[PDB]
Each structure stands twice: as C-alpha cells, then as structure tokens.
Symmetry: C2
C-alpha cells in the first residue's frame, strides 16, 4: 500500500512499532537485497526515541572488496540530499555523520554481517534530541511528516546505490562536495594528532595535514577544534 | 515510521511492492501474532495496484467453536472503515462486502493449527472486474490508500481484542451490517432457495425455504447467490 517505485532499495519494508535494533535484526535475519527495516523506536540503538527515522537496509553489492568502505557514504549523501529537499543544508562530518550548523542531525552505521552488508541510518526528525544536536523539526520550526522523509530518503538511496553498482567512484566526489573540509581536527586514540582535514582520497580515507607538514591518512573518533 | 498505536494487529508490518499472495506468505513464513503482510499488488491473488491487499497472522486463544467467526472480524472491520469514508458497505454472508450489491471487498481465512491467517482484499483505487466496485468509483475520486490502511488496522485491532474477551460480540455487529430479508440461493450438493433470515449463535446463516423448512448453512463447501 506504500506504492514505492524504487528498483532495489524498498522492494520490501519491514516496519516495527518497537525493536531492539534495526541493524541487529537485519544482520541476523535472512532478507532479500533491498529490504528496509524500520521502527518507530529502538530500545538498544548504537553507533532512538519516537519521532525519528530509524532504519537499516540490506545490501549485497557484487563490487570489488576495496570500495566496500564506501557504503557508509551512500547513506550520508542520501541524507544530505533528502535534507536539501526539505530546505535544510546538511554537511558531512567524515565519515558517518551529517551536521546542520555543526549540530548533528543524522548518523550512519555500516556492518558487514556474513556476505551481506547492512546500512544503518538514524535521522532526527521530530524526536527530542540531546543538547548540541538538532532535528528537522527544530530546523524547520514544525513537525515534519515522517513518512514523507522516509519516501524521500529511500528514493535517493535507491538511485545512489544503483549508480554505485556501476560507477562506484562517483560517490566519493559527492561526499567531497558535501563534507566539512579545510578545518582543524583531532584524531583521538593512541598516537593521537591534530591537523587540517584536507580531503578524502580514492579509498575514502581522510587526509590530514599536520602542522609539521606530515600527511596522514585516516581509515575513528574525530573532533573539530 | 508508520507510528501505529495498535495493541496486537500491526505490531509489525511487512510491505511488498509485489507478492504472489499475502495469505500464502503469511501461512508459510515464521511470523509473530499481529504481523500484517501487505502488498501493492498480488500476482496470484491478479490483485492490481490501487487496492488494499493484506493478511494478518492471528493466534486467538479461544475455543475452536469460535474460530469460524474470524472471517466476520474481517468483514465488520471493512464495513466500519467504509462507513468512516461514508460508503455503505453491507455484508454478504459470510466473507464479502458489497455496495449496492457490487463486491468491494473479500475476506479469506486459512488456519493450520495454532496460526490463523485473516486475508482481506479491498478495492480502493484499482480497476475492478464487471459487477464489482471500488472506493474510488463510489466516492468519485481517488482515496489515500495509506489512510484506508490505517483506518482498517485500527478497527481490526479493536475488534480482535474484544473477540478474545467476548467472542460472541462480533455476531451482533455482523447482524447489524449484513444483507438479510432477501431471497438467496445456496450452492453446494443439493442447492436450495429461501429467505436469508439471520445468522445464529454459531454464525450459521438461517434460511427459510418456501415450504417453511428452516436450514442452517455452515461456511465451507458452499456459495451464496442473490436472486
């Protein structure tokens, strides 16, 4: 009854009033490629109250092993395109987040269970959000039809994915033109360091120029300074 | 993303752009009670795009003598939804809803032990066969398919929960919304004609033959035709 017109993503949709995790369900259940798992709320979300868009998409891209790490970008760019349709300007915080005026509005989590890949996306729409974060509702000043957002996002993801299967390098430039670059960041963890986020390379790695001139490639906890 | 607020029916919903049969998928698959299977179209129902094609997995803990009444939950739910859209649906015993004697919806219940599958087919915006009708044809314009879905699921959940408590309650609702007082022909072994008087405490159709004989029809290996 949803009348989705997508080719792969959205061929089937499994909706839950409540679920522990859409990613976990997608990983442990046999599902046809393109199956979308969506829930009103997730009890055990990871990286999800009522009002947000919480979903996972089952993919099985028969593409080279090296571009597998690009699936996360499909999710982020998909979100950016959807936000634009709703008059919101989202920017990608490498490698899995979308911010609006530096406030997080969405997050992406990709897991490769077995031979299938699960693309998880969490987008704040009408749900309450933690201080520092934002939502489509807070940006627009009014409640946004959640199903309208779902339809828009699924449509964009199906298009991006079909093209990815043919021209897998295309997504990188879309990410570049929509990500936060030219600013100082810090990579947390052992061997921590700071520098300018210059660009992403052909593998999707973040290229950091340290003040010494050294160039590092990040394949991760990132912080804007 | 659908934000359903039902107790059992609609806890989960599996949507298909296309499927062979929602009833067959529901019967075959391992699904929890209340799961709704819905598709834009059924290739082996064909049930064309524009209609509402769904099946619901149920596991009612009530005596078997009541199981035959599940088809009525479907029929009444459809009637209630139609009334919400100001369409006068009337029940054709025991598994169809007509509007001006033209079929607008059909109900098919299939059960295997514990799991019962309630299938419902409702013509909304789809083209229909001769003699049939649709919500679109009745209202004169297209109807938001999702709105009909939300309406029906809400009605079915309420009806089902009450059925678990009071399995006889549904019979009163069927009586108030069914076509009665008219002549009908019952097709089976030895077909016969008479006036459809009412449905009894088991949901059996009560027919008064011209001779005065009263026959009680059990759904199963019989069909009903209006004269």
């Amino acid at each position: 009854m949803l009348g989705l017109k997508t080719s792969i993503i959205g061929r089937r949709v499994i909706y839950f009033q409540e679920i522990t995790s859409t990613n976990e369900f997608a990983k442990t259940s046999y599902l046809e490629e393109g199956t979308v798992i969506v829930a009103d709320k997730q009890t055990m979300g990871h990286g999800s109250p009522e009002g947000g868009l919480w979903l996972s998409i089952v993919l099985s891209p028969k593409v080279p092993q090296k571009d597998l790490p690009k699936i996360v970008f499909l999710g982020a760019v998909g979100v950016v395109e959807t936000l634009k349709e709703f008059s919101i300007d989202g920017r990608i915080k490498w490698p899995n987040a979308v911010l609006v005026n530096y406030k997080k509005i969405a997050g992406v989590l990709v897991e490769g269970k077995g031979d299938k890949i699960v693309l998880g996306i969490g987008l704040n729409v009408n749900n309450k959000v933690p201080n520092g974060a934002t939502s489509m509702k807070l940006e627009l000043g009014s409640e946004v039809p959640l199903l309208s957002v779902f339809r828009s996002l699924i449509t964009n993801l199906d298009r991006l994915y079909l093209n990815f299967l043919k021209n897998p390098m295309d997504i990188l430039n879309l990410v570049r033109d929509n990500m936060i670059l030219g600013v100082r960041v810090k990579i947390l963890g052992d061997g921590s360091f700071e520098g300018i986020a210059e660009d992403i390379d052909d593998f999707g790695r973040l290229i950091i120029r340290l003040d010494s001139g050294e160039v590092k490639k990040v394949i991760v906890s990132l912080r804007f300074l």
